[PDB]
Design a protein around this nucleic acid. Structure first.
Ligand SMILES: Nc1nc2c(ncn2[C@@H]2O[C@H](COP(=O)(O)OP(=O)(O)O)[C@@H](O)[C@H]2O)c(=O)[nH]1
Ligand SMILES: [Mg+2]
Length: 199
RNA sequence: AUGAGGUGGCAAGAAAUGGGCUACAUUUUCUACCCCAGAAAAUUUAGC
């Protein structure tokens, strides 16, 4: 309700959003009529990127699995032809937000090979997952490395699971069980969580 | 002529039994990957 549009958006000949209306209306038009949902998303982005520059609010763009934008799609036409990511309006409008042509906010993203298309299981580095086009788009950027648990973090996570009584095996609270879990997971948070799930 | 040729004709149906070929899925199927993802929907024959 505080954020308001600066243009007249025409959903159809009968319905339009007038200048100065709250942004929520636009969202509502996307939530009520799905036909205009995709058009409603882009407008929101178009507004949020612009108004944040004016200084009305601070904007955070949190995109998880950002590598999808500059890759390949598994969506097909009716002629069984491949569709490129840029041919999707939802993907096309979200690329404009990743460009550093606006101020008043920060862009944070996380890579992900899980659910990625046409990538090997062991690819995790920025260029390998992003592609040349993705690296060129994001460049310049600050990469931040996320690693496996160090011994302090591993011990604290196991203590958290024990405090929640989530390790029911009698040998789990002992020290030998902790060494075995450490070796089996290699301090990987996801493998440790999955192993502790059924113990 | 138990050799070589010409002409036409010869098309088959019933059960009772034996075998063979196909698909038969949720512990499944399609895509990415090659395993931390997303969507769809009783008799009897052998073997160890
Ligand atoms: N239904 C509707 N959608 C709009 C309208 N204006 C912008 N949009 C959508 O909001 C997005 C804003 O992105 P934009 O700045 O216009 O980039 P452009 O598509 O290349 O012109 C567009 O991609 C449209 O999908 C409008 O007047 N009516
Ligand atoms: Mg005959």
């Amino acid at each position: 309700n505080q954020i308001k549009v600066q243009e007249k958006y025409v959903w159809n000949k009968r319905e339009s959003t007038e200048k100065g209306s709250p942004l929520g209306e636009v969202v509502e038009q996307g939530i009520t009529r799905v036909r205009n949902a995709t058009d409603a998303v882009g407008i929101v982005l178009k507004e949020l990127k612009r108004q944040s520059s004016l200084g009305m609010f601070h904007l955070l763009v949190a995109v998880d699995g950002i590598n999808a934008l500059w890759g390949r799609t598994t969506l097909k036409r009716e002629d069984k032809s491949p569709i490129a990511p840029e041919e999707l309006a939802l993907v096309h409008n979200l690329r404009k937000m990743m460009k550093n042509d606006w101020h008043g906010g920060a862009i944070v993203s996380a890579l992900s090979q899980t659910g990625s298309l046409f990538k090997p299981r062991k690819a995790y580095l920025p260029q390998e997952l992003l592609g040349k086009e993705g690296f060129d788009a994001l460049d310049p950027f600050i990469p931040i490395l996320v690693s496996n648990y160090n011994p302090k973090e591993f011990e604290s996570c196991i203590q958290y699971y024990l405090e929640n009584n989530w390790l029911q095996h009698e040998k789990a609270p002992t020290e030998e069980g902790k060494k075995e879990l450490l070796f089996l997971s290699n301090a990987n948070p996801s493998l440790l969580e999955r192993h502790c799930a059924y113990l």
